[model samples]
Target: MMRMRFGVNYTPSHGWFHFWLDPDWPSVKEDMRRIRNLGMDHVRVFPVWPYLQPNRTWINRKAIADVRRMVHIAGEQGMDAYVDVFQGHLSSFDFLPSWLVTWHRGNMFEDADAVKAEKTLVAELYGELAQEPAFRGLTLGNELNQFSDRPHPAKMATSSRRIDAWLADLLAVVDRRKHVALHSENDGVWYLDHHPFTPVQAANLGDMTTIHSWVFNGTAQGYGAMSGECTAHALYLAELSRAFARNPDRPVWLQEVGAPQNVLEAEQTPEFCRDTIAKAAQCPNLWGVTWWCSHDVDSRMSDFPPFEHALGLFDEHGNIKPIGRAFAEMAQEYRDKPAAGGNDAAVVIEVDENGNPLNRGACGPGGSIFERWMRLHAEGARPTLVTSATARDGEALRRLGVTRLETDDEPHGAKYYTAV
Candidate 1:
């Protein structure tokens, strides 16, 4: 058991108004009120980099004032606002400042001047918000792994170090009293090979580790095929964070996790929402889970792609979806669960190419499943024994508290068990 906090990654309807740049304050207040009413404790708001500081030399004071007002509004509703900084790579576009492109392209971490400018922006933003009670902390950047095109993948380690150092500079200006994090994409395919900052590095550096878990994008999409089950991937992410975390106690926050309902034939239903939340609850180290958004963007913002527009818990008209109610129910149900005293049993799942347990895939339980089992074994749980004939012969499983496999063929479904 772990004390969990639930939050949402918020952006107002992506139509005529941008929250950080051109905001309608009254509308935002209603949004915050609705979010709080739904049982969310925090709202992660983005500071669209180019919008907040169009010119690198000058900080937009009006944007800062707007943020201050929004933070105050969130506070009144008992919700804290975590400011997401340097939202250069958001949705499908690079929201870059002209000066940034002209000066260093996307290599701010490596360019001294750009890094200094970033420091100035961060300092000013944090300096103002530090005094506000609702201003919880800052997330250094949004999916920085996708920031600027880069050198070969091999150079990523060095680049990651520089990125971390740049974040340290920003962290210097961040109030010590406030929490801070470096956000990263949860998938290894997304960050491990191509990007500098891995989740482990982010966790080691920041007060908390943040990961965006979008089930329908990139390699992790679809419950079947190569993508794998979404809930399993979420647990695997927790395992990855725990494996690399410098601080064993450091919390892994699932900063963004949701699916687009309108875009898919079989939409992600309230049942899907409940199951994912329950899976996250089972992980001892995963502390928080936030949906990708509170409300859908208006289709009038045609610049955005189709899927992006429909990825919301609420429609553009502010009506709650079944998923939204399910999320609220989960938050209420688990908010006060007692903390874990020690390690517990791990979950096991069997799936085929089409996400059915009855049919087995040709491949052995691959990297994701391997890591999940290893993490659970390390945490004092029985090794996950998939229904395979040769599994018991290996010394590996026995060493991890799995000695035998028992199978059942009941009306409910096929079931497999390992001795505890």
Candidate 2:
């Protein structure tokens, strides 16, 4: 099993948009400290587009300095900073710079002037933070596919290619010492081959390929809607399995994964978060996983949607949610695990609603002989599954190469699968 790293996407303790627009070093320092204390190894921070480049010719040097300072603070706490550029389309709003489209009707990717402006922004931003010890790397943009407000894969290819070229230039200017990643939208209607940029292109263009998954959001096409009966854990696992299968060679990271408290309602428990982490860790080719956010956002911030305000692992009062604690615990559990290697059998275990593995004695939440089997199984010493006979819907597990199920009748864990 390869060492699996865990981290959270960070917005300032205050809010996301305002953090970079108006740099708050003190608040940011506190947030980074909390994240490091949570046993996280990295933090993904976004540079809001309009804030950085409010005008095409005018790049906000002050905001750039603030970003550098924040990255420095992250380093002080031993956390690598993953900077995502051009956060024009964040939450549900488009934070496009006023001047971005002044000259280029709409298509910034193909517009010559817009492309130049983008390059300028990238050069200015990357030039300053390129060699910083704590600067983990750069992501071209946040779900650029969504910039057009719809999925136009055929039309966006030219733009995707252009951005890919820009990413290379920026990386070269930075001497390529730092890691660079490009994040794609979820496995929604416009993903993979359907998106303007395919996962295959991402693997070839950048150092790593990243994907975002949210169960409730209609973004998960194959997974059903955000309803009471939906299983986020199972759906998320299936999405990751598809991404891993698609980009087999390049390291795939779950760039954004989270369950908002409001969105989860009754399902909002530490166990739910734990199950998500556990399942994500099972990916054989996963580079790392960054939780959707570190702290909850202020409801007063009008930039975000109502549902996004409560997505943080921590409450606004700085108290840890059950999910927050679960994240820290899971981080430590897999800190020293070996990298994935060798052949292994996928294990599918059926359990009762309480998460006890059926027929398996005393299989409690997370730590069980079956769980240990999973940890080892994650390392690739191929093994088969022993599931209950009643748990028949193993289609998702089989898709991930878990076949040959041996079932029995016993009240055990819910539908869960790990490498045997």
Candidate 3:
């Protein structure tokens, strides 16, 4: 049977593993193996959108090879990988694609002068990449909300129509071998609520529906409203489950949701992630949950920098964090108790790197998501964590005592990290 398909999202931005620079292929393979061993069945990545067709006339050789290597490695590790195609955020400039930067949005579609240029660009990119063996799915756009300042409802009606037409035309040329998923925000609930799906047109768009979450922004200064945060998340899932409960045509994916920590004091992050996963497992339509990333990033804009980031399952030095342990524990626990339905609350704990236990009530008291995860992963729970030393990261993994590192740092080419 196809398993619960738990996975992690491997993005170019703030990820433990980066394929942009084409890390050593052998080392990359090892990294994939490790993630698979974590009991995950899949991984998702943005397939070098601009890099693949930077000039709009031809394909980049290196970019093509990297896609093949990444996907092949995933398959070898017995994992299915999804490739996300996003026109915007090419170099991390929030929301601007090279093609759309110059187009007059209002008149570009009808202007005779722009038709040839736009079609040529789309056709070239669509034709070449649509054939790539590694591509598992297509993300119409990455967070379309970034493109406009207005709420999703005000803009989605027009944008969705345009994007829908674009994907339809693009599919005419690209091969449909693997599953086709509409890469949407985790809050598709909000979108559908505002812009209900039209059975006449959007009924058969793709094979799955996905939603992401970022309840507590990752900065580590203080805290946010935990109860309200959890409720909003639950409500989102509840609404989405109710909408798609009858349509098994596509499964729902918690594409993103995890509490991040930069400083050690945000130690409750692990429990939060665990609880999120446990909640996700309960949703009947949930295909699986994909953790945002494996490593934290330092330079949010440039894919060129090294170190300095902090949003990964493992630290920069490759030390597995409590979050990683929680993820692993959830997967293992599910495997251990397949008949119990594997649906349970997450554990809540407030412990440091060492075994010394900390009081959960101090962080945010009994009502916090942290508290819930801690409670689930108690002494007898299936999803529990194995703590580690060196709460914060410094030097390289091997040098920092994490010989069996969680990340692989093998660069494919030196300048590619810069020029690409």
Candidate 4:
């Protein structure tokens, strides 16, 4: 079984992750020291995409050394590092190269030049980062899917199959020994409809599944911060990832979950962090919980939204916040503990060709799946989500430890759903 773990997205306290542009090695050393003091096992770090590869044909070797240094620094503190080579889309910002997405540019997933450049970036960057033992793996990008199929001038339209092919080709650039995941925002793909990057792709494509659980996605807004829905969003997404994973042993990574106090009071953060981790621990194949940030953005840094500025475990001046203390306490409390064991139940929903669930509205507490999950939890059952594709396999259902299968779809046969 994979070890359950805890870590943070390694954002610097003073200059933020964007500081990679200038390369602040000394500051990052201190950042790693602070994270180590708290007992985190690893750090998810990002390299600003455009800074490294401003043009499709040119690769900056200087940035590579900075990345290598970051991984080595992480190893010195006894923590592993996973590098997102292209910080494709982070914290509601895009780091894409202009050559890749000009006004008359082609689809990112299907364009010949775009595809070739993406592959080269991965092969070159990941190949170098793999030299360090502390470097765990690669993520295709922060959330590449968010760059398309939505209302924005930069967004492009493409078929889901093309995106699937794109991911497969890009992932091939990395060595198989390392775990590579395609990170995605907590929207259109997982809980919304008409999305090209479907939930199935999120669950099944990479070596491990990734879930970026932001409670702002109707999770806390529709439900209170401490409510089952808000606190258990990561847990729900984890279970849902397992349900759709075609690979039996795939691990679910809580890649970017953070408590957005803008939705609630700042002091309530500690309780929220405690409850979130406690609930997320129930995921059986969980790899770890990497909180959204390591250090709070400096107050002097002006452009960020209020929530982004304060999500860090350590404050801008290197002081541990109240929530940081609570996180440390819980890390010790849950470390070495086994996943929670309980009865299993599966919920079925409609799925399209791309393995994405249909009809779950974007960011709504009233979503059908959300309601179904809350109902199951209230009834004292552990709910595992199942795409309609896998709901038909009796042996597969048994393998998932699902004694009972529930579905709101049209009844096709007596055996489609039942108590065994």
- Give RMSD to native, each candidate: 9.0, 10.7, 16.2, 4.9
Relative to the true structure, candidate 2 has a C-alpha RMSD (angstroms) of 10.7
lDDT of 1 at 17: 31
Candidate 2 per-residue C-alpha lDDT over 115-233 given as tens digits, one digit per residue, 9 for 90 to 100: 77877887788888875789877787777766542443323235445655655654453445555645454443112222344333444556666767665533122222342213333
TM-score per prediction, in order, is: 0.77, 0.72, 0.62, 0.92
Clashes of each: 1, 19, 18, 0
Assess each prediction's global lDDT (C-alpha) against the native.
0.61, 0.60, 0.46, 0.76
Instruction: Please name the candidate that would achieve the greatest TM-score relative to the true structure.
Output: 4
- Write one digit per residue (lDDT tens) for candidate 3, span 1-420: 455667877643223234564556675576676677788877876654556655544556677666666777777788777766554432224332254345523222233443344355444544544454544665554554333323322232234455456445544443455446464543322322222222112324555566666553221222243433342353234222322222433466677665644322357667666666665554444566788776555344354423225556765545567778888887776533332222222222223432222321222212232333334433323221111222232232222122221111221211111121
Off by over 4 Å in 3: 11-23, 90-92, 95-97, 102-136, 148-159, 171-177, 186-204, 217-225, 228-235, 244-249, 261-265, 299-308, 335-420
Give the C-alpha lDDT of model 1.
0.61
Query: What lDDT is obtained when candidate 2 is compared to the true structure?
Result: 0.60
- List candidate 1 stretches off by more than 4 Å: 14-17, 102-106, 148-158, 185-191, 218-228, 261-266, 340-420
**lDDT score, candidate 2, position 75:** 96
The better-scoring model by lDDT among 1 and 3 is 1
Per-residue lDDT of model 4, residues 267-369, tens digit only: 8888989988888887777778888888888888676778888898888899899888888888898877877664388778666665566554511355556
- On the 0 to 100 scale, the lDDT of residue 155 in model 1 is 21
Q: Judged by TM-score relative to the true structure, which candidate is superior, 2 or 3?
A: 2
Could you tell me which residue pairs clash in candidate 1? 1-340
Best by lDDT: 4
Candidate ranking under TM-score, highest first, comes to 4, 1, 2, 3
